[PDB]
Amino acid sequence: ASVHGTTYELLRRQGIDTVFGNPGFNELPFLKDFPEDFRYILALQEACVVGIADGYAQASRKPAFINLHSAAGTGNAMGALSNARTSHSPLIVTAGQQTRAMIGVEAGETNVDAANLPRPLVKWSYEPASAAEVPHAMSRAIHMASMAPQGPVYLSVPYDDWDKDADPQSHHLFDRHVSSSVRLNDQDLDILVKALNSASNPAIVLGPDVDAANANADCVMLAERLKAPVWVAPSAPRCPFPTRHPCFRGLMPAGIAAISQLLEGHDVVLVIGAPVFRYYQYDPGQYLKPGTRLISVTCDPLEAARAPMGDAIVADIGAMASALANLVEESSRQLPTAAPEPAKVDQDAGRLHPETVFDTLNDMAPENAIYLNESTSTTAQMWQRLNMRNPGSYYFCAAGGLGFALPAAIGVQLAEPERQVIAVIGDGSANYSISALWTAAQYNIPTIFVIMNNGTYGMLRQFAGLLEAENVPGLDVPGIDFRALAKGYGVQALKADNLEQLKGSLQEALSAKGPVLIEVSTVSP
Ligand SMILES: Cc1ncc(C[n+]2csc(CCOP(=O)(O)OP(=O)(O)O)c2C)c(N)n1
Ligand SMILES: [Mg+2]
């Protein structure tokens, strides 16, 4: 049968038909004789490779298979893998390794200490000891990434292994299925349910793993029965709730003191699918005001152990959310009032304000559109001004790693052809993963790229305001032509220097059959 044939049989039997890669010499014996039932998505830089696969996996809610070249190709993808760890993203990262006979010699393209290079961003890293073990190793790689908490995994395979004969017992791997859909036992669950019904002013914090689980609808019901406000946890990688539902309270501030003040007055605070408050800024204070008890449901033991406060349960987010929403009694309390409609900012005929750009997206864009965010100074306004009523409608780099949104948008749009993907990316952020645009052109993935050009790293200048950071170099990015960049990679390029220009550009981009980039002149932060 051979390792090559057996592995490709194992991948299809495990449901994988797509390979996101940038080719290399160690990868040719694996890439050769490519099965007709598989499809290869090529990106020009390995950060783009993983980013595309990442968005594809997050929207599909299935594993994604990557093929990179040795250490150099693995190294270029490490920033993406960092984002891919904090988003519990099921990624099977494979890298070709030199012939076993020359690894000790360290011949050119040898990945030295290969399993250590991904760490500590990968749940599992491995280099098989024997060619016939490779399929088994791939099997571990798939399940490791698939099993909760979902995470990136790494497998280095010497290129001489693919032609060798596979183990005849490797066929037992093909139909292996491991379940993680677990929930709290009835006795402890009923205790929790009794505490939610007893709470006089409960509150719900929802994290990215809620959207990863597609537990949004269950979380809506739970919020309705509890008649409880709902916040999305800070540094949110995803949107787990309808942003215009009367219970939704918006994006929590990323500060210790600021979160405990918001939570003050709620006896029970139920967190689901979220790390227990990840803070960006140092806002020292009380983690919790007195009279507030916190219960956290998480798929990740690291999150449960990490918490500075509260109880925690390590279970499946989907199974827990569905159990809690169907078990709780409907509260007599009145439903919370929907947050106020956002105000319209003054907009002259000149450079566009971010608020105006987000309002124009909301009226113009489809109700089932998918948004992506790498405009770091405008996140607060984007959450307020974009009505996202459906799951899988928002993605933001989980670890804050720039270069995610542009390639990921191509991956999401590939995963969801029926939904229109609009990526709002700031200037400067677009540079990290710029080559990915080519993949959208070559495969005609019709992602819309909206570039917010202010000529600066807006968030960095704003933050340098918090604290007296004066005379900080490297904060301005003047003189980039994004329409020229989009042409270089074959993406149709549009511009928008005013509102009417923006309105027209958007209507055109929505009608386009190919990818489109719109460079937007925006006002400085
Ligand atoms: C890979 C990486 N490099 C650098 C940073 C630091 N960083 C955080 S926000 C930011 C500015 C982003 O620029 P832009 O898209 O213009 O954002 P805005 O003007 O909206 O703040 C930078 C450089 C990062 N988070 N990740
Ligand atoms: Mg900017």
111 & 169 share domain: yes
Q: Is residue 338 part of a domain?
A: no
CATH assignment at residue 290: 3.40.50.1220
Q: How far is Cα 417 from Cα 421, in angstroms, rounded to an integer?
A: 9
Ligand nearest to the CA of 280: 1
Q: Is residue 110 part of a domain?
A: yes
Ligand nearest to the CA of 424: 1
Of 431, 460, 480, 521, which is best to mutate to test ligand 1, by the most ligand atoms within 8 angstroms of its C-beta? 460
For ion ligand 2, residues whose CB falls within 5 Å: 426-427, 454, 458
Q: Is residue 449 part of a domain?
A: yes
318 & 382 share domain: no
Cα 82-88-89 angle, rounded to 5 deg: 75
Residue 136 in contact with residue 161, Cβ under 8 Å? no
361 & 508 share domain: yes
Using omega within 30 degrees of 0 as the cis cutoff, is the peptide bond preceding 149 cis? yes
Å from CA of 462 to ligand 1 middle: 11
- In the chain, how many domains are there? 3
Q: What are phi and psi of 164, to 5 degrees?
A: -65, 160
Q: Is residue 343 part of a domain?
A: no
Q: How far is Cα 81 from Cα 47, in angstroms, rounded to an integer?
A: 8
Cα 75-81-85 angle, rounded to 5 deg: 150
149 & 271 share domain: no
14 & 153 share domain: yes
CB atoms within 10 A of CB 350: 11
Which one of 134, 150, 173 terminates a domain? 173
Which one of 144, 173, 202 terminates a domain? 173
Find residue 518's DSSP bridge partners.
Answer: 450, 494
CA of 376, closest atom in ligand 1: 20
Q: Is residue 345 part of a domain?
A: no
Q: Is 456 annotated as a binding residue?
A: yes
Q: How far is Cα 75 from Cα 69, in angstroms, rounded to an integer?
A: 9
Q: Alpha carbon of 41 to those of 38, 51, 183: distances in Å?
A: 10, 12, 37
Handedness of CA 196, 199, 200, 203 (dihedral sign): negative
User: What is residue 262's DSSP assignment?
Assistant: H
Cα 28-31-36 angle, rounded to 5 deg: 155
CATH assignment at residue 387: 3.40.50.970
Q: How far is Cα 2 from Cα 164, in angstroms, rounded to an integer?
A: 5
DSSP string, 322-362: HHHHHHSPPPSSPPPPPPPPPPPPP--SSSBPHHHHHHHHH
250 lines ligand 1 (CB under 6 A): no
456 lines ligand 1 (CB under 6 A): yes
Which residue's CA is the nearest one to ligand 1's atom 3?
A: 402
CA dihedral 406, 409, 410, 413 (to 10 degrees): -170
277 & 421 share domain: no
Q: What is the SS3 assignment for 521?
A: strand
400 lines ligand 1 (CB under 6 A): yes
Residue 413 in contact with residue 447, Cβ under 8 Å? yes
144 & 213 share domain: no
Q: How far is Cα 173 from Cα 142, in angstroms, rounded to an integer?
A: 11
Residue 58 in contact with residue 87, Cβ under 8 Å? yes
First-to-last alpha carbon distance for the chain, in angstroms, is: 61
Find residue 493's DSSP bridge partners.
Answer: 517
Ligand nearest to the CA of 475: 1
Q: How far is Cα 192 from Cα 159, in angstroms, rounded to an integer?
A: 53
Å from CA of 255 to ligand 1 middle: 20
Residue 429 in contact with residue 379, Cβ under 8 Å? no
Candidates 447, 456, 459, 455; CA nearest to 514 is 447
401 lines ligand 1 (CB under 6 A): yes
Domain that residue 503 falls in:
354-521
* Structure resolution, Å: 2.5
In what order do the strands lie in the sheet containing 293-298?
Answer: 248-251, 230-232, 203-206, 268-272, 293-298, 311-314
Q: How many helices (H) and strands (E) does the chain have?
A: 21, 18
Å from CA of 523 to ligand 2 middle: 9
Residue 411 in contact with residue 362, Cβ under 8 Å? no
Q: How far is Cα 116 from Cα 371, in angstroms, rounded to an integer?
A: 35
Residue 397 in contact with residue 459, Cβ under 8 Å? no
Which residue's CA is the nearest one to ligand 1's atom 18?
A: 458
Å from CA of 372 to ligand 1 middle: 15
Using omega within 30 degrees of 0 as the cis cutoff, is the peptide bond preceding 340 cis? no
Å from CA of 373 to ligand 1 middle: 12
Q: Is residue 410 part of a domain?
A: yes
Of 457, 521, 522, which is best to mutate to test ligand 1, by the most ligand atoms within 8 angstroms of its C-beta? 457
Tokens of 93: 């990262």
Tokens of 209: 């793993």
Which residue's CA is the nearest one to ligand 1's atom 19?
A: 458
Of 429, 453, 482, 523, which is best to mutate to test ligand 1, by the most ligand atoms within 8 angstroms of its C-beta? 429
Amino acid occupying residue 142: I
Rounded to 10°, the helix 317-327/216-226 angle is 30
Q: Is residue 169 part of a domain?
A: yes
Q: What are phi and psi of 13, to 5 degrees?
A: -65, -30
Q: Is residue 377 part of a domain?
A: yes
297 & 426 share domain: no
Residue 163 in contact with residue 2, Cβ under 8 Å? yes
CA dihedral 240, 241, 247, 252 (to 10 degrees): 40
Q: Is 119 annotated as a binding residue?
A: yes
Q: How far is Cα 398 from Cα 395, in angstroms, rounded to an integer?
A: 8
Q: How far is Cα 333 from Cα 196, in angstroms, rounded to an integer?
A: 13
Which one of 107, 140, 173 terminates a domain? 173
129 & 220 share domain: no
User: What is residue 315's DSSP assignment?
Assistant: S
Question: How are beta strands 421-426 and 370-374 bridged, if at all?
Answer: parallel
128 & 9 share domain: yes
